[PDB]
Amino acid sequence: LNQPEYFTKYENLHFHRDENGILEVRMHTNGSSLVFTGKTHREFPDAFYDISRDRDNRVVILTGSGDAWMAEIDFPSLGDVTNPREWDKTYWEGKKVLQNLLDIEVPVISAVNGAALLHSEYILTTDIILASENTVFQDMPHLNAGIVPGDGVHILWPLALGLYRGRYFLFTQEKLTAQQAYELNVVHEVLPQSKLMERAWEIARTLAKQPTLNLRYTRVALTQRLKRLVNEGIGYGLALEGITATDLRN
Amino acid sequence: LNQPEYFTKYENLHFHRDENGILEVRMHTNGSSLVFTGKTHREFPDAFYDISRDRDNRVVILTGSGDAWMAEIDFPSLGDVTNPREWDKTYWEGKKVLQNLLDIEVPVISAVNGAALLHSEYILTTDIILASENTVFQDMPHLNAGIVPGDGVHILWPLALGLYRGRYFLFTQEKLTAQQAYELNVVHEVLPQSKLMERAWEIARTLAKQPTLNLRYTRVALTQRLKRLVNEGIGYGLALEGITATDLRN
Amino acid sequence: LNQPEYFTKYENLHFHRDENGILEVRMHTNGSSLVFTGKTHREFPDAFYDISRDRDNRVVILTGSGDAWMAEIDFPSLGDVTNPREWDKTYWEGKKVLQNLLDIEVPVISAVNGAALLHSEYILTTDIILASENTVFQDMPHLNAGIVPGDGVHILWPLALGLYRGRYFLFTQEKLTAQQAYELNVVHEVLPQSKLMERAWEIARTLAKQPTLNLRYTRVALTQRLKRLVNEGIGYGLALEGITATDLRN
Amino acid sequence: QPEYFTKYENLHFHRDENGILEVRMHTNGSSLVFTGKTHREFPDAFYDISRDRDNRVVILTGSGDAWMAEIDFPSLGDVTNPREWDKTYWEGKKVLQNLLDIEVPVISAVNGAALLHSEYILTTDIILASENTVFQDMPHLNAGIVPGDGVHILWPLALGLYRGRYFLFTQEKLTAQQAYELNVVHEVLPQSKLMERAWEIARTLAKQPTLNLRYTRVALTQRLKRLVNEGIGYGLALEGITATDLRN
Amino acid sequence: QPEYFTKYENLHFHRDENGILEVRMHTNGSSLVFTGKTHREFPDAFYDISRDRDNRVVILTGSGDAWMAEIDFPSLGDVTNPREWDKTYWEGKKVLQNLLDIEVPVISAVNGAALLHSEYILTTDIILASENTVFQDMPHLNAGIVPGDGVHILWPLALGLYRGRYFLFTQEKLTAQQAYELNVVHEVLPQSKLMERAWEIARTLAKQPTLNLRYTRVALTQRLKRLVNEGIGYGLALEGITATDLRN
Amino acid sequence: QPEYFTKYENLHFHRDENGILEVRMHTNGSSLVFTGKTHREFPDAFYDISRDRDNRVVILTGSGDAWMAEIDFPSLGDVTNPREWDKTYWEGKKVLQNLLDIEVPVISAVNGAALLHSEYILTTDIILASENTVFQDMPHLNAGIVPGDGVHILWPLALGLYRGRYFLFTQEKLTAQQAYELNVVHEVLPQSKLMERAWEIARTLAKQPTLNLRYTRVALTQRLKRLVNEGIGYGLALEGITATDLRN
Ligand SMILES: O=C(O)C[C@H]1CCCC(=O)C1
């Protein structure tokens, strides 16, 4: 096929792009809802870089598969996080994944297709957030494991919910429904499961009518402050998280 | 009359100030709702500077005329925005208008008297925002023209609505009613059209009972962060906007 | 008793800590709701430093006594605030109280037991905010006295309510009920008076199950931006406030 | 010529066909005596300069043997009264904002002693000094008030945060040669050659396209503007409190 | 060896058993001619270097008598067209981000004239130069476009916000000795000894534990990264507008 | 005299009628051996100094022939255990915060080698050194851990972001004369004259009104405080990870 090589380079991402440069990127594990792994932690930064480098991507839709956006993780596959020499890989990849995802230089629409229980900081880099009615949001794994929620959730959830409710949400592992997230201005439209992707594409097609440089530079203008905020705290959060992972040996 | 010369220097601004130093500044075009022009883009920065320099202004009320705050623009009068040598004037004036409006050193009350479809970033520099029931807010012209919403809306709407709903609002050209804006904490009171100005003056009179230096330094204290945020992004937004205007020739 | 010496060092703070390292700190004046004084303005920074230094404090609950959190102040006891040589003490202590309260290195739960009419910026340093049904919030004293609300309220209320409603709230001395504050995401749970402290302890006990370093470093991660924002504006607010206090002599 | 060329009793203006504007501070043709009037009017003059797109390069200089070495202290008003200091405070924020907002390269031709208001020089892009020049923050610690008018930000930027604080706290005086070694002054010239050199540099710059002059100035002043904004109001409020304390 | 060692026609790679990687820029074995190709590929190369944990110290150098003194201007594409400049803009942000994100100490061995892209050198931790080296921002004011590609941030960081602006606005040339005195160059070596010294320094560093090399690099680049991020996109957008204006 | 004057086994305090406080670090009257105890107690001492409004100028110095050249490594506790390092981390943030929060001018009298904890000196306003003084970041790269305790921020501030990184990564040693040339040291004195000069400078300062001393210190440390706050916790967390890695 005439499509870019990177479209089929990632076992856990499906890519489809229309003639308008609207790219839908769908996370999956063997076609089912994603199980997050060491492999995805390593590869996703590269995938987001590849998407960002390709000037034929004019709008991006980021979504998951099945009835969850991301609700499963294969903890052992992440490597021995209690060993700082292994955590350093995770730390490096944690800084790159958000840098590279922010550096996508066109509007990014999240189509949140169900529970987002980990790695919801990805959603919080995107410009328009649509959620199916069954969606819930939670920072599940960190306080389950006893390690710092230091991978960007610590910056982006307090930006989303404000520095009061955002800290309550993280410290208590609060779960928000799609409707709550909508009232909290995180989700912008709540859709039936059967209509979520159609609506994402409809918004994308309207955006695609813009001149290319306008799509790109509006994205730049609207992400400057967000990038500064992420850069401020991402490395420190992930370093603190690494120390708490080490401490699990104590 | 004994009033300052600058009160009658601006064809598109009416000025009235009471014995308490409460200054009402009303935008108009021949007494009707304002039609924004190259002339206002050039003169408004000077008007806001003049207001800020005059220590007899103790509270400012900024409003429009008729049934719209600002809903019309004479696009050709702005000059050839696709020519960078002409856009540079617009760029320079775009940085000065927000700098000078923020540097008004007393509380500023917005009395939003109807549709605010362009230049709503002015409202988002002010301290107390009142709106008539017929008011709506939208960033109309930028994505209509295909150029970046880079004149301060890119900073101030995400500050107002948060960095999620704020980006949705700009990318989709969302229109908010006065009631929606009130629920979103942008508008602080929604008034009947017939009561808007009376309420602005009532709030102003309460404020005017404060010592002058308290009015001034409370304004300073409450605008430090806002000024930093505007300075961060205003020039870059307007430069990106200029490039997209040039690109319309392609 | 085996408890730390600092537990009984402060006439206006009662301390109680359980075997899980959950420390409840309760402000009082002779067992009644606190009357804020020059003495508390001077001592509270030391108390918060002492709490922060003690690694046996694993979660902190900060509360008041009786039916108000803080609703009274003995103005004369603050010293001659109109004399810059006296205000300088207040200025120095104003910077230290927020620095030291932020530097508590474990989650801090506010249990707001009634009206918080002054010094609510303390609450706005904490991570989880619970309020009894009778609670109200207001910046009462500053615009009553004619001096700048420059002690941290100018930073933290606009962070809590956004830079629009936050400035309206301060300039108009708005009073918010517990229910309003809950809708505004400042208060996270509204409790009957009889259940407030039980709920604070229940949340604390859940948190106390975390590893110690996770409690500490999650607090660090979630307060980096907050600390930067407070540092940006606290000294300038308090200096401006001092000038307005001097001006009361004019 | 523009009306503003003759609006300011303490500034002479001359502009050539290339858009090179020389702005010369003076008191009756002599070295400037700084006053309440200049404190109030200079922000307006710098704004007027910045608004005029026909200015393509700016040279800012003084008159006679000193760039600025004199001040009429009573003419600043009763600085010990916060209501009067507030004028000075507002004007002190505006002067640096408006000076930095000149949107073309600015050359300082420092024609002798700069003992006050040297922060103006530290907004400029190319700094030339005559061999007789000395730099000092004279007035603040002489009067017992904070050096809070931008010197507190820009001298530590120029000399680093170590020598910059020594310079301010001890009211150190720097010769032109020392300032050159410290990278503040870029060329040291004989008095009789200073202005010719300033104009030579300006002519070379003026050969650039106008947008390049403007946007190179913008690019090279972003960080500088942020740093001044961070500290200027706080420094001037603290200074005001120390001025009030002169009554005690 | 890694695949990326042979992916870049203008970069030679050699790595020893200690994880010391030497990256040498060249055009057919000679001193680099900078091109549209290098502008596009170098960001990828620096990313690839940064991803590879077997790199424990990096030495970045040029070939022949110059570090970088040549550029094929037409090969950069039609910079006066905003749609083409946008590629240069995106690549200009990525090159510095990816270079700064190399997570080990980086030694510059500057093997002669660095007349363009010297901002790469100003991301590195230890700067060595051969005695023949000169530094200049040559191309920008030659072409009439903003020096907006990071030189506008990093030269004023290196030389201070006074000499740094003089250096850019006048296209000043600095010898290796001047740059040494200005604390930009840390050791000046004969041409024939430069690379041996770079490798000696690298060997001493390589004795550190790997996490120490990595986290010392992180600690020492936090502020630097913030400063570059502040200004890089704005500088490159302004530069693009001046490139467009070359048509007028 | 205040109780805190005798609370610290490693600090001697002496204050004159002008409010000039000399704080001298020592171990049994000799040059300081830095310990876990000093790491824990110094933050409290600096807080106590800062709280006491009778301190109008502070001189911070060492004893004997060295300012700080010795450390009892085992006394710092088992730094390789994150639960123990956390104490060092918390204390490392507090020491610089509390030292910077001294609200009057601070004079460093550096009485010889400063081989560790030189970041304390880099919080002070006027830096004097005896001719025998040398500066180095000795311990971090000797132990294989990040120089993350503020040296990573303040040395690059002092020497610039180029020479500052060379100095840290190579554990460069600077003589008093070099440090003077680099604008870190402001006066170089014979050993026998150092303290007299410190007190002379302090006496001149002490003639200022108290609020002026305080608010000039505030004005001149705003930026410095921001820079330290930006990086101190991150540097100390990274350092802790490298300390843990010493087990591997
Ligand atoms: O995916 C990550 O961010 C790293 C994992 C490592 C294992 C425990 C977690 O939940 C986080």
Ligand SMILES: O=C(O)C[C@H]1CCCC(=O)C1
């Ligand atoms: O008023 C402005 O900000 C400039 C105009 C220029 C023409 C197109 C627009 O809507 C914006």
Ligand SMILES: O=C(O)C[C@H]1CCCC(=O)C1
């Ligand atoms: O408690 C304070 O912050 C200082 C007081 C001083 C007296 C007037 C006030 O309300 C504030």
Ligand SMILES: O=C(O)C[C@H]1CCCC(=O)C1
């Ligand atoms: O010129 C100024 O900045 C104002 C004056 C204020 C009074 C004494 C001075 O030297 C400075």
Ligand SMILES: O=C(O)C[C@H]1CCCC(=O)C1
């Ligand atoms: O190499 C670059 O950064 C791009 C070019 C753009 C055109 C002229 C130049 O010298 C710089």
Ligand SMILES: O=C(O)C[C@H]1CCCC(=O)C1
């Ligand atoms: O004194 C310190 O900052 C702590 C120690 C930590 C262990 C080895 C060192 O040299 C630094």
Ligand code: NI
């Ligand atoms: Ni912010």
Ligand code: NI
């Ligand atoms: Ni800086």
